[PDB]
Amino acid sequence: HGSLARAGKVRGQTPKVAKQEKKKKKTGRAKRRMQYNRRFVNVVPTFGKKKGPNA
Amino acid sequence: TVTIRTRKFMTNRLLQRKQMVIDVLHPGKATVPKTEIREKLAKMYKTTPDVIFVFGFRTHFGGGKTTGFGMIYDSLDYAKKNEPKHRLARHGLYEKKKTSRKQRKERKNRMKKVRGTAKANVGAG
Amino acid sequence: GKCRGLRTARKLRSHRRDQKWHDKQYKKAHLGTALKANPFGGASHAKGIVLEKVGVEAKQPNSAIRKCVRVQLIKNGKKITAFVPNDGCLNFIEENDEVLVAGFGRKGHAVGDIPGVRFKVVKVANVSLLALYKGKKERPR
Amino acid sequence: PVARSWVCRKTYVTPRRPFEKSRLDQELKLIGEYGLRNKREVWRVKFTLAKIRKAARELLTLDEKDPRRLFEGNALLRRLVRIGVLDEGKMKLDYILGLKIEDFLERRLQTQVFKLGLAKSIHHARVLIRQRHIRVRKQVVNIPSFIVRLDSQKHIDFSLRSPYGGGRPGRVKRKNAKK
RNA sequence: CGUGCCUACCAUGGUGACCACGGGUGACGGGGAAUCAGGGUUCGAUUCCGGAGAGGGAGCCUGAGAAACGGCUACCACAUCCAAGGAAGGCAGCAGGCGCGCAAAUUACCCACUCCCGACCCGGGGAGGUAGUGACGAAAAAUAACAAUACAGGACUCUUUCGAGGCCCUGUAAUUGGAAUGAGUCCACUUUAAAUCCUUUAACGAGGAUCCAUUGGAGGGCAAGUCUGGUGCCAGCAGCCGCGGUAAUUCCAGCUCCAAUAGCGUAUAUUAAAGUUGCUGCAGUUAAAAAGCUCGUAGUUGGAUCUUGGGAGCGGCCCCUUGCC
Ligand SMILES: [Mg+2]
Ligand SMILES: [Mg+2]
Ligand SMILES: [Mg+2]
Ligand SMILES: [Mg+2]
Ligand SMILES: [Mg+2]
Ligand SMILES: [Mg+2]
Ligand SMILES: [Mg+2]
Ligand SMILES: [Mg+2]
Ligand SMILES: [Mg+2]
Ligand SMILES: [Mg+2]
Ligand SMILES: [Mg+2]
Ligand SMILES: [Mg+2]
Ligand SMILES: [Mg+2]
Ligand SMILES: [Mg+2]
Ligand SMILES: [Mg+2]
Ligand SMILES: [Mg+2]
Ligand SMILES: [Mg+2]
Ligand SMILES: [Mg+2]
Ligand SMILES: [Mg+2]
């Protein structure tokens, strides 16, 4: 029926972007420590009509 | 430096042996070796060192006590009689000289094949 | 409505053992036709050999040309329309290669975009298709 | 054939509903409050509290004058007192069910270090109990998941170690650099 | 040894709608395992007990014990050396090889422990034990941590303070250390039949080329972006609803988050949710479903009625019916 030539067209024509030099991430107990200290120490001035975990 | 104390102590007069549990305490350096523990126990029992054995040692996770089982005898002949050859092998009283696999079993098969004079020729050499 | 005596438990187990077959799951799990009719012989995965590469059509609201592989099995010897998962991998699946296959999400039904394909490609010639879609573990030939 | 040991106990319960926002916030504030690694060691405490509640409800099912109930209830109360969750007061079985998850996390090792000094920021107290620098008794403790019994409750030490036990772990590097 | 186990004669019995008989089992039976109200449902070849077999089935010596198979005999299917006339074989024992496969480990060491066997304190044991592969699975469990100096993004006690901070998270690719401790590198121990690993210890042993945490997702279920660039019903994503036809909250990539964490996704069998198998506990006017009506066997169920108030002694025995003589 249809043609079989168009395979991986978007993956081929998508221009590549180099992954930047991201710094290392603290993991495990340190990661749960920063997850607690990211959303449980300085959130209370905000109001419930808006939430900002990503924007 | 070290402190060697026996916790449990039994005596079997049937073999003239004295069994004990030995704790050697270390607030300091590494595990004191077999020969040095043997010499200190020989000095504390005030007899000859060649009659007292000990086996097994633990370590209670950071210095601490090392626990073993000590055997005080009263005769070297009784030590040769009532002890295994591998615990005589710590001081080299017994040697086997053929600690090899498949040698005994292949001599068994070469004696199983032939019989008599040829069996004495092949299996003994 | 029911039968609620003290000596009626044979009538109960008879009626329940009869009426338990009208559930679809019980009869497809305890009737032999769902083992001697399906492929795989009632297994999880199967190897197979590529026979051809077919561009099938999609359904009515979704207009797409899905890429499938007709696969000759080794265990039973049947023919299975498998499925090429990712955006590429049509150039990574060549002709007559060892292909491991599995299901989509359910044994009976299929995915609501492809009409008659129940099975999915996992490996290509003993090297994983996730590796062939990523950069590592390049193909032999 | 072989006969050594075959046993398999799981102190690990994944909850049914995976993603509840209030429960995830509760578990995150619990981890950030009591200084924990991951949520499986929250689920440990949750499963142990659940098993104690199972035993307590099985005892409360029984008749009051039953000798098995009296023996098992007195033994369970004795074990909870020697852990240190309960008190020497209410020795009833409903007082077992009237508990929370935070009591066992309080009776763990480093929270007793928080209540009795030498803690200095629980996330650093994790390091202080991993590295051999906090020693409940002559048998050295090396484990964060350590339930401190109330019968001793006061023995916090360290011997032959860096800050007071004595030694040059890496200050010999600094002395060789200056010399 | 009791047995229709077998024979001679005699009688016509024996089982079944309470399911026999006849088939199928991807059926070895149990103790048990998984699944969290209760009730149940599904596996159990597998380490303990019992049964059966040593390629198929038949027969048998020895022996107390075998229809034995690391015993023998004959047939069938394989299969070894053959100077061609004959011999010789059984890994569903321990390794290992081919094939089958989605699918499963080394031609290792030792009788040191457990025991077993024999004439026997001494010999033997791929029974076993130890080591090697091992992310089936279970328990503990670091991943750059940590307390300090400073720029302050500022939260908070209070004085018009545009700050006095003996309290707070945060980017600091900024410093200081304890130069924390671990993994590895290795001396000596210890374990051990001889060794390996944990444990004990001497000496090296982190400052971002560090000694680097992945697996999936970010429209709803279900946590997280109405971010940016291409692609423009093509590629594809999506287990379902659905997205993509030039402005994609779903494709590809980048950034940033989120889920659990040295265990995450996937497929399949199964369990709970499933009160969608309902005995607890489902329905039958219209959603799927009450036989056209009636009789009736087996089954299931079946009115009431026959021991009664009280006595001794307080804050358990009998009579006025309460073990028969
Ligand atoms: Mg489906
Ligand atoms: Mg007859
Ligand atoms: Mg259950
Ligand atoms: Mg149950
Ligand atoms: Mg029998
Ligand atoms: Mg047999
Ligand atoms: Mg065979
Ligand atoms: Mg045999
Ligand atoms: Mg054999
Ligand atoms: Mg995706
Ligand atoms: Mg995206
Ligand atoms: Mg959400
Ligand atoms: Mg999926
Ligand atoms: Mg219904
Ligand atoms: Mg209708
Ligand atoms: Mg109808
Ligand atoms: Mg009708
Ligand atoms: Mg009737
Ligand atoms: Mg009646």
PDB file of all heavy atoms in Angstrom, chain E residues 42-52:
ATOM      1  P     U E  42      -9.495 -21.260  41.671  1.00  0.00           P
ATOM      2  OP1   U E  42     -10.094 -21.680  40.381  1.00  0.00           O
ATOM      3  OP2   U E  42      -9.646 -22.125  42.867  1.00  0.00           O
ATOM      4  O5'   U E  42      -7.941 -21.013  41.433  1.00  0.00           O
ATOM      5  C5'   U E  42      -7.490 -20.185  40.371  1.00  0.00           C
ATOM      6  C4'   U E  42      -6.027 -19.859  40.511  1.00  0.00           C
ATOM      7  O4'   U E  42      -5.796 -19.102  41.724  1.00  0.00           O
ATOM      8  C3'   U E  42      -5.099 -21.050  40.639  1.00  0.00           C
ATOM      9  O3'   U E  42      -4.807 -21.637  39.387  1.00  0.00           O
ATOM     10  C2'   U E  42      -3.879 -20.458  41.334  1.00  0.00           C
ATOM     11  O2'   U E  42      -3.040 -19.803  40.396  1.00  0.00           O
ATOM     12  C1'   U E  42      -4.516 -19.398  42.239  1.00  0.00           C
ATOM     13  N1    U E  42      -4.647 -19.836  43.648  1.00  0.00           N
ATOM     14  C2    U E  42      -3.548 -19.686  44.468  1.00  0.00           C
ATOM     15  O2    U E  42      -2.489 -19.226  44.079  1.00  0.00           O
ATOM     16  N3    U E  42      -3.719 -20.094  45.766  1.00  0.00           N
ATOM     17  C4    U E  42      -4.865 -20.624  46.318  1.00  0.00           C
ATOM     18  O4    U E  42      -4.874 -20.948  47.506  1.00  0.00           O
ATOM     19  C5    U E  42      -5.961 -20.744  45.412  1.00  0.00           C
ATOM     20  C6    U E  42      -5.816 -20.355  44.142  1.00  0.00           C
ATOM     21  P     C E  43      -4.018 -23.030  39.312  1.00  0.00           P
ATOM     22  OP1   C E  43      -4.377 -23.696  38.035  1.00  0.00           O
ATOM     23  OP2   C E  43      -4.221 -23.742  40.598  1.00  0.00           O
ATOM     24  O5'   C E  43      -2.490 -22.595  39.227  1.00  0.00           O
ATOM     25  C5'   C E  43      -1.461 -23.560  39.348  1.00  0.00           C
ATOM     26  C4'   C E  43      -0.290 -23.036  40.137  1.00  0.00           C
ATOM     27  O4'   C E  43      -0.758 -22.210  41.239  1.00  0.00           O
ATOM     28  C3'   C E  43       0.557 -24.095  40.810  1.00  0.00           C
ATOM     29  O3'   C E  43       1.470 -24.718  39.930  1.00  0.00           O
ATOM     30  C2'   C E  43       1.219 -23.322  41.936  1.00  0.00           C
ATOM     31  O2'   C E  43       2.289 -22.536  41.436  1.00  0.00           O
ATOM     32  C1'   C E  43       0.089 -22.381  42.359  1.00  0.00           C
ATOM     33  N1    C E  43      -0.723 -22.908  43.489  1.00  0.00           N
ATOM     34  C2    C E  43      -0.213 -23.052  44.796  1.00  0.00           C
ATOM     35  O2    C E  43       0.959 -22.749  45.074  1.00  0.00           O
ATOM     36  N3    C E  43      -1.024 -23.524  45.774  1.00  0.00           N
ATOM     37  C4    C E  43      -2.287 -23.848  45.509  1.00  0.00           C
ATOM     38  N4    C E  43      -3.055 -24.313  46.495  1.00  0.00           N
ATOM     39  C5    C E  43      -2.833 -23.713  44.207  1.00  0.00           C
ATOM     40  C6    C E  43      -2.028 -23.241  43.253  1.00  0.00           C
ATOM     41  P     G E  44       1.568 -26.317  39.896  1.00  0.00           P
ATOM     42  OP1   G E  44       2.488 -26.702  38.797  1.00  0.00           O
ATOM     43  OP2   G E  44       0.183 -26.851  39.919  1.00  0.00           O
ATOM     44  O5'   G E  44       2.253 -26.681  41.286  1.00  0.00           O
ATOM     45  C5'   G E  44       3.549 -26.199  41.605  1.00  0.00           C
ATOM     46  C4'   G E  44       3.962 -26.598  42.996  1.00  0.00           C
ATOM     47  O4'   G E  44       3.257 -25.796  43.980  1.00  0.00           O
ATOM     48  C3'   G E  44       3.635 -28.022  43.401  1.00  0.00           C
ATOM     49  O3'   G E  44       4.520 -28.981  42.864  1.00  0.00           O
ATOM     50  C2'   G E  44       3.659 -27.935  44.916  1.00  0.00           C
ATOM     51  O2'   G E  44       4.996 -27.863  45.388  1.00  0.00           O
ATOM     52  C1'   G E  44       3.000 -26.574  45.132  1.00  0.00           C
ATOM     53  N9    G E  44       1.541 -26.712  45.288  1.00  0.00           N
ATOM     54  C8    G E  44       0.583 -26.381  44.367  1.00  0.00           C
ATOM     55  N7    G E  44      -0.629 -26.625  44.780  1.00  0.00           N
ATOM     56  C5    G E  44      -0.460 -27.155  46.047  1.00  0.00           C
ATOM     57  C6    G E  44      -1.421 -27.609  46.982  1.00  0.00           C
ATOM     58  O6    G E  44      -2.652 -27.632  46.874  1.00  0.00           O
ATOM     59  N1    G E  44      -0.824 -28.071  48.146  1.00  0.00           N
ATOM     60  C2    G E  44       0.526 -28.094  48.380  1.00  0.00           C
ATOM     61  N2    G E  44       0.907 -28.576  49.570  1.00  0.00           N
ATOM     62  N3    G E  44       1.433 -27.672  47.517  1.00  0.00           N
ATOM     63  C4    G E  44       0.873 -27.220  46.377  1.00  0.00           C
ATOM     64  P     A E  45       3.918 -30.294  42.170  1.00  0.00           P
ATOM     65  OP1   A E  45       2.595 -29.931  41.609  1.00  0.00           O
ATOM     66  OP2   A E  45       4.021 -31.420  43.130  1.00  0.00           O
ATOM     67  O5'   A E  45       4.899 -30.564  40.951  1.00  0.00           O
ATOM     68  C5'   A E  45       5.352 -31.874  40.655  1.00  0.00           C
ATOM     69  C4'   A E  45       6.836 -31.880  40.417  1.00  0.00           C
ATOM     70  O4'   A E  45       7.153 -30.941  39.358  1.00  0.00           O
ATOM     71  C3'   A E  45       7.689 -31.419  41.586  1.00  0.00           C
ATOM     72  O3'   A E  45       7.930 -32.443  42.532  1.00  0.00           O
ATOM     73  C2'   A E  45       8.946 -30.919  40.898  1.00  0.00           C
ATOM     74  O2'   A E  45       9.760 -32.008  40.494  1.00  0.00           O
ATOM     75  C1'   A E  45       8.359 -30.274  39.652  1.00  0.00           C
ATOM     76  N9    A E  45       8.050 -28.853  39.870  1.00  0.00           N
ATOM     77  C8    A E  45       6.813 -28.288  40.039  1.00  0.00           C
ATOM     78  N7    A E  45       6.839 -26.993  40.210  1.00  0.00           N
ATOM     79  C5    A E  45       8.188 -26.688  40.146  1.00  0.00           C
ATOM     80  C6    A E  45       8.886 -25.478  40.255  1.00  0.00           C
ATOM     81  N6    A E  45       8.276 -24.310  40.459  1.00  0.00           N
ATOM     82  N1    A E  45      10.232 -25.511  40.151  1.00  0.00           N
ATOM     83  C2    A E  45      10.838 -26.685  39.942  1.00  0.00           C
ATOM     84  N3    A E  45      10.287 -27.891  39.826  1.00  0.00           N
ATOM     85  C4    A E  45       8.949 -27.821  39.938  1.00  0.00           C
ATOM     86  P     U E  46       7.876 -32.119  44.104  1.00  0.00           P
ATOM     87  OP1   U E  46       8.150 -33.383  44.830  1.00  0.00           O
ATOM     88  OP2   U E  46       6.633 -31.364  44.389  1.00  0.00           O
ATOM     89  O5'   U E  46       9.114 -31.148  44.341  1.00  0.00           O
ATOM     90  C5'   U E  46      10.444 -31.610  44.170  1.00  0.00           C
ATOM     91  C4'   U E  46      11.423 -30.466  44.117  1.00  0.00           C
ATOM     92  O4'   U E  46      11.000 -29.494  43.129  1.00  0.00           O
ATOM     93  C3'   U E  46      11.560 -29.654  45.390  1.00  0.00           C
ATOM     94  O3'   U E  46      12.393 -30.280  46.344  1.00  0.00           O
ATOM     95  C2'   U E  46      12.110 -28.329  44.878  1.00  0.00           C
ATOM     96  O2'   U E  46      13.504 -28.431  44.636  1.00  0.00           O
ATOM     97  C1'   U E  46      11.400 -28.201  43.529  1.00  0.00           C
ATOM     98  N1    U E  46      10.214 -27.315  43.588  1.00  0.00           N
ATOM     99  C2    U E  46      10.434 -25.965  43.406  1.00  0.00           C
ATOM    100  O2    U E  46      11.541 -25.497  43.208  1.00  0.00           O
ATOM    101  N3    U E  46       9.315 -25.176  43.462  1.00  0.00           N
ATOM    102  C4    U E  46       8.020 -25.589  43.676  1.00  0.00           C
ATOM    103  O4    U E  46       7.115 -24.756  43.699  1.00  0.00           O
ATOM    104  C5    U E  46       7.868 -26.997  43.854  1.00  0.00           C
ATOM    105  C6    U E  46       8.941 -27.790  43.801  1.00  0.00           C
ATOM    106  P     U E  47      11.787 -30.802  47.735  1.00  0.00           P
ATOM    107  OP1   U E  47      10.715 -31.787  47.456  1.00  0.00           O
ATOM    108  OP2   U E  47      11.482 -29.614  48.568  1.00  0.00           O
ATOM    109  O5'   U E  47      13.003 -31.587  48.390  1.00  0.00           O
ATOM    110  C5'   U E  47      14.329 -31.398  47.904  1.00  0.00           C
ATOM    111  C4'   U E  47      15.261 -30.945  48.998  1.00  0.00           C
ATOM    112  O4'   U E  47      15.880 -29.689  48.614  1.00  0.00           O
ATOM    113  C3'   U E  47      14.597 -30.697  50.346  1.00  0.00           C
ATOM    114  O3'   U E  47      15.523 -30.997  51.389  1.00  0.00           O
ATOM    115  C2'   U E  47      14.327 -29.196  50.307  1.00  0.00           C
ATOM    116  O2'   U E  47      14.199 -28.588  51.574  1.00  0.00           O
ATOM    117  C1'   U E  47      15.554 -28.683  49.554  1.00  0.00           C
ATOM    118  N1    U E  47      15.334 -27.437  48.803  1.00  0.00           N
ATOM    119  C2    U E  47      15.243 -26.227  49.465  1.00  0.00           C
ATOM    120  O2    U E  47      15.305 -26.104  50.674  1.00  0.00           O
ATOM    121  N3    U E  47      15.047 -25.137  48.658  1.00  0.00           N
ATOM    122  C4    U E  47      14.950 -25.123  47.284  1.00  0.00           C
ATOM    123  O4    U E  47      14.777 -24.054  46.699  1.00  0.00           O
ATOM    124  C5    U E  47      15.069 -26.406  46.671  1.00  0.00           C
ATOM    125  C6    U E  47      15.255 -27.487  47.433  1.00  0.00           C
ATOM    126  P     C E  48      15.547 -32.457  52.063  1.00  0.00           P
ATOM    127  OP1   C E  48      16.742 -32.523  52.937  1.00  0.00           O
ATOM    128  OP2   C E  48      15.345 -33.505  51.033  1.00  0.00           O
ATOM    129  O5'   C E  48      14.263 -32.465  53.000  1.00  0.00           O
ATOM    130  C5'   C E  48      14.390 -32.539  54.410  1.00  0.00           C
ATOM    131  C4'   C E  48      13.099 -32.977  55.042  1.00  0.00           C
ATOM    132  O4'   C E  48      12.090 -31.953  54.844  1.00  0.00           O
ATOM    133  C3'   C E  48      12.475 -34.232  54.454  1.00  0.00           C
ATOM    134  O3'   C E  48      13.032 -35.425  54.979  1.00  0.00           O
ATOM    135  C2'   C E  48      11.006 -34.064  54.796  1.00  0.00           C
ATOM    136  O2'   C E  48      10.770 -34.443  56.140  1.00  0.00           O
ATOM    137  C1'   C E  48      10.821 -32.549  54.683  1.00  0.00           C
ATOM    138  N1    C E  48      10.248 -32.122  53.381  1.00  0.00           N
ATOM    139  C2    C E  48       8.907 -32.385  53.038  1.00  0.00           C
ATOM    140  O2    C E  48       8.168 -33.009  53.820  1.00  0.00           O
ATOM    141  N3    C E  48       8.441 -31.966  51.839  1.00  0.00           N
ATOM    142  C4    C E  48       9.234 -31.295  51.005  1.00  0.00           C
ATOM    143  N4    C E  48       8.733 -30.894  49.835  1.00  0.00           N
ATOM    144  C5    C E  48      10.583 -31.000  51.331  1.00  0.00           C
ATOM    145  C6    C E  48      11.036 -31.421  52.514  1.00  0.00           C
ATOM    146  P     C E  49      12.968 -36.797  54.140  1.00  0.00           P
ATOM    147  OP1   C E  49      13.810 -37.796  54.840  1.00  0.00           O
ATOM    148  OP2   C E  49      13.231 -36.483  52.716  1.00  0.00           O
ATOM    149  O5'   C E  49      11.454 -37.276  54.272  1.00  0.00           O
ATOM    150  C5'   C E  49      10.928 -37.690  55.524  1.00  0.00           C
ATOM    151  C4'   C E  49       9.479 -38.092  55.413  1.00  0.00           C
ATOM    152  O4'   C E  49       8.663 -36.944  55.052  1.00  0.00           O
ATOM    153  C3'   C E  49       9.156 -39.114  54.339  1.00  0.00           C
ATOM    154  O3'   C E  49       9.473 -40.440  54.720  1.00  0.00           O
ATOM    155  C2'   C E  49       7.673 -38.883  54.104  1.00  0.00           C
ATOM    156  O2'   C E  49       6.907 -39.485  55.136  1.00  0.00           O
ATOM    157  C1'   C E  49       7.572 -37.363  54.255  1.00  0.00           C
ATOM    158  N1    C E  49       7.624 -36.650  52.952  1.00  0.00           N
ATOM    159  C2    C E  49       6.532 -36.649  52.060  1.00  0.00           C
ATOM    160  O2    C E  49       5.498 -37.279  52.333  1.00  0.00           O
ATOM    161  N3    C E  49       6.643 -35.981  50.887  1.00  0.00           N
ATOM    162  C4    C E  49       7.755 -35.316  50.589  1.00  0.00           C
ATOM    163  N4    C E  49       7.831 -34.659  49.432  1.00  0.00           N
ATOM    164  C5    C E  49       8.864 -35.294  51.468  1.00  0.00           C
ATOM    165  C6    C E  49       8.747 -35.950  52.622  1.00  0.00           C
ATOM    166  P     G E  50      10.009 -41.477  53.619  1.00  0.00           P
ATOM    167  OP1   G E  50      10.401 -42.723  54.323  1.00  0.00           O
ATOM    168  OP2   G E  50      10.995 -40.773  52.762  1.00  0.00           O
ATOM    169  O5'   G E  50       8.725 -41.794  52.732  1.00  0.00           O
ATOM    170  C5'   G E  50       7.626 -42.502  53.281  1.00  0.00           C
ATOM    171  C4'   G E  50       6.430 -42.481  52.366  1.00  0.00           C
ATOM    172  O4'   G E  50       5.945 -41.123  52.194  1.00  0.00           O
ATOM    173  C3'   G E  50       6.655 -42.962  50.943  1.00  0.00           C
ATOM    174  O3'   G E  50       6.686 -44.374  50.827  1.00  0.00           O
ATOM    175  C2'   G E  50       5.484 -42.334  50.211  1.00  0.00           C
ATOM    176  O2'   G E  50       4.305 -43.065  50.489  1.00  0.00           O
ATOM    177  C1'   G E  50       5.395 -40.974  50.901  1.00  0.00           C
ATOM    178  N9    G E  50       6.174 -39.965  50.162  1.00  0.00           N
ATOM    179  C8    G E  50       7.357 -39.401  50.552  1.00  0.00           C
ATOM    180  N7    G E  50       7.823 -38.542  49.689  1.00  0.00           N
ATOM    181  C5    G E  50       6.905 -38.560  48.652  1.00  0.00           C
ATOM    182  C6    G E  50       6.886 -37.843  47.429  1.00  0.00           C
ATOM    183  O6    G E  50       7.706 -37.018  47.011  1.00  0.00           O
ATOM    184  N1    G E  50       5.772 -38.158  46.659  1.00  0.00           N
ATOM    185  C2    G E  50       4.799 -39.049  47.025  1.00  0.00           C
ATOM    186  N2    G E  50       3.793 -39.242  46.162  1.00  0.00           N
ATOM    187  N3    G E  50       4.808 -39.722  48.162  1.00  0.00           N
ATOM    188  C4    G E  50       5.882 -39.436  48.926  1.00  0.00           C
ATOM    189  P     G E  51       7.505 -45.070  49.631  1.00  0.00           P
ATOM    190  OP1   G E  51       7.482 -46.534  49.862  1.00  0.00           O
ATOM    191  OP2   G E  51       8.804 -44.367  49.503  1.00  0.00           O
ATOM    192  O5'   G E  51       6.649 -44.765  48.321  1.00  0.00           O
ATOM    193  C5'   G E  51       5.369 -45.352  48.126  1.00  0.00           C
ATOM    194  C4'   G E  51       4.718 -44.867  46.853  1.00  0.00           C
ATOM    195  O4'   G E  51       4.614 -43.422  46.861  1.00  0.00           O
ATOM    196  C3'   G E  51       5.461 -45.177  45.567  1.00  0.00           C
ATOM    197  O3'   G E  51       5.221 -46.495  45.117  1.00  0.00           O
ATOM    198  C2'   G E  51       4.945 -44.111  44.611  1.00  0.00           C
ATOM    199  O2'   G E  51       3.680 -44.481  44.086  1.00  0.00           O
ATOM    200  C1'   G E  51       4.747 -42.922  45.548  1.00  0.00           C
ATOM    201  N9    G E  51       5.867 -41.963  45.521  1.00  0.00           N
ATOM    202  C8    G E  51       6.686 -41.700  46.585  1.00  0.00           C
ATOM    203  N7    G E  51       7.582 -40.791  46.338  1.00  0.00           N
ATOM    204  C5    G E  51       7.350 -40.438  45.023  1.00  0.00           C
ATOM    205  C6    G E  51       8.028 -39.499  44.214  1.00  0.00           C
ATOM    206  O6    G E  51       8.990 -38.788  44.521  1.00  0.00           O
ATOM    207  N1    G E  51       7.491 -39.431  42.936  1.00  0.00           N
ATOM    208  C2    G E  51       6.427 -40.176  42.498  1.00  0.00           C
ATOM    209  N2    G E  51       6.046 -39.978  41.228  1.00  0.00           N
ATOM    210  N3    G E  51       5.784 -41.060  43.250  1.00  0.00           N
ATOM    211  C4    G E  51       6.289 -41.140  44.498  1.00  0.00           C
ATOM    212  P     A E  52       6.417 -47.367  44.501  1.00  0.00           P
ATOM    213  OP1   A E  52       5.956 -48.774  44.438  1.00  0.00           O
ATOM    214  OP2   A E  52       7.660 -47.033  45.239  1.00  0.00           O
ATOM    215  O5'   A E  52       6.560 -46.817  43.016  1.00  0.00           O
ATOM    216  C5'   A E  52       5.463 -46.851  42.115  1.00  0.00           C
ATOM    217  C4'   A E  52       5.753 -46.045  40.876  1.00  0.00           C
ATOM    218  O4'   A E  52       5.780 -44.637  41.207  1.00  0.00           O
ATOM    219  C3'   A E  52       7.102 -46.303  40.229  1.00  0.00           C
ATOM    220  O3'   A E  52       7.081 -47.435  39.379  1.00  0.00           O
ATOM    221  C2'   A E  52       7.383 -45.001  39.495  1.00  0.00           C
ATOM    222  O2'   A E  52       6.691 -44.968  38.257  1.00  0.00           O
ATOM    223  C1'   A E  52       6.748 -43.975  40.427  1.00  0.00           C
ATOM    224  N9    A E  52       7.706 -43.320  41.338  1.00  0.00           N
ATOM    225  C8    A E  52       7.823 -43.541  42.684  1.00  0.00           C
ATOM    226  N7    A E  52       8.727 -42.802  43.273  1.00  0.00           N
ATOM    227  C5    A E  52       9.234 -42.032  42.244  1.00  0.00           C
ATOM    228  C6    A E  52      10.226 -41.044  42.209  1.00  0.00           C
ATOM    229  N6    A E  52      10.913 -40.647  43.279  1.00  0.00           N
ATOM    230  N1    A E  52      10.501 -40.462  41.025  1.00  0.00           N
ATOM    231  C2    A E  52       9.818 -40.854  39.946  1.00  0.00           C
ATOM    232  N3    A E  52       8.859 -41.773  39.851  1.00  0.00           N
ATOM    233  C4    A E  52       8.611 -42.331  41.046  1.00  0.00           C
TER     234        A E  52
END
